Amino acid sequence: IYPLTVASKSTTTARHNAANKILKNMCEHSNTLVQQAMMVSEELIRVAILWHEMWHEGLEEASRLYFGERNVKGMFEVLEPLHAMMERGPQTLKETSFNQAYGRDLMEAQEWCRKYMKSGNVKDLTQAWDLYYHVFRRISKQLPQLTSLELQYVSPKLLMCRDLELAVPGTYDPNQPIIRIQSIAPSLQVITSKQRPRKLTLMGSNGHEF
């Protein structure tokens, strides 16, 4: 169940279509298992990198490509997925909060990048980077302040499960009884580091915390 979900989320079309074909076959005998796994997989990756986390990495990589590698087409392709996720609308208060503080600047900067593709003037692209760099400075000043996350603020769907038939990740053998996920802690801690990993504590069906 776990490897197939990763394949179904791949960017490649060949892997995406092939993975989903196997998944729908599993829905016959066990439909509720795959549905829970898809919900868990989408929420876990959301918590790992937030909206302001993706922009900090995307803008930093895009800036190096444009000013260091002198590549323009490679800069746009990095920023296209970032603007695509904001057009689908926020699904939580944290995403809603981001869409209010930085919503106007990012959306307007896309418009200037759209005029550069047609007019071709260098000034349009330069004026676009004025908004991108202004947001980058603001985000970089609040990353160190991030040290703890509340599940209600980032993803309300994780704390409203209270029961799952999906086994705890990393522990499954055919010769042992299956242990399922019971609940997820309402708060997780962020370790102060360059990558800022999160500490997620689950709750097994046998009363043992993982």
Partner: protein, 157 residues
């Protein structure tokens, strides 16, 4: 999603706690090298040996050896833990050599508190990648320094 191994702490933090308790600066060895030669990074190969060899002679490396004994409730437990540490570091040295592991800085080395075992993390640089890079190419198969070799046993390695 990486599982969390309990009862284990990294080597860098383990030494740091010992030195700060004994009123010892964390970077005494580094300070001596800069004091003798401020432009240490720009020195030639033969000149860096002179600075490096001088630093290790003025400071006795036994922090790890005394660290393990002070955390052992009894001598019977101390000997058992030391035996496990000696033969767990040797296995990862040869296995890591075949795999070509690199960038084995102390932050990527963890020592089990209850059993004395050695755990490796961050398996990112493999197959001699770190040796061929142009930025500080390390030229050693595995990490075996004076701090580690002075804790396995008194007779040496």
């Amino acid at each position: 999603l990486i599982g969390w191994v309990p009862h284990c702490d990294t080597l860098h933090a383990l030494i740091r706690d010992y030195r700060e308790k004994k009123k010892i600066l964390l970077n005494i060895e580094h300070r001596i090298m800069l004091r003798m030669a401020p432009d240490y990074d720009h020195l030639t190969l033969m000149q860096k040996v002179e600075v490096f060899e001088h630093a290790v002679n003025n400071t006795a490396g036994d922090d790890l050896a005394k660290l393990l004994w002070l955390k052992s409730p009894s001598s019977e437990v101390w000997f058992d833990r030391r035996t496990n540490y000696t033969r767990s570091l040797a296995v990862m040295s040869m296995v890591g050599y075949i795999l070509g592991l690199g960038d084995r800085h102390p932050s990527n080395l963890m020592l089990d508190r209850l059993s004395g075992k050695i755990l490796h993390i961050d398996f990112g640089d493999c197959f001699e990648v770190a040796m061929t890079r142009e930025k500080f190419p390390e030229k050693i198969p595995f990490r075996l320094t004076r701090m580690l070799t002075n804790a396995m046993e008194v007779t040496g390695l």
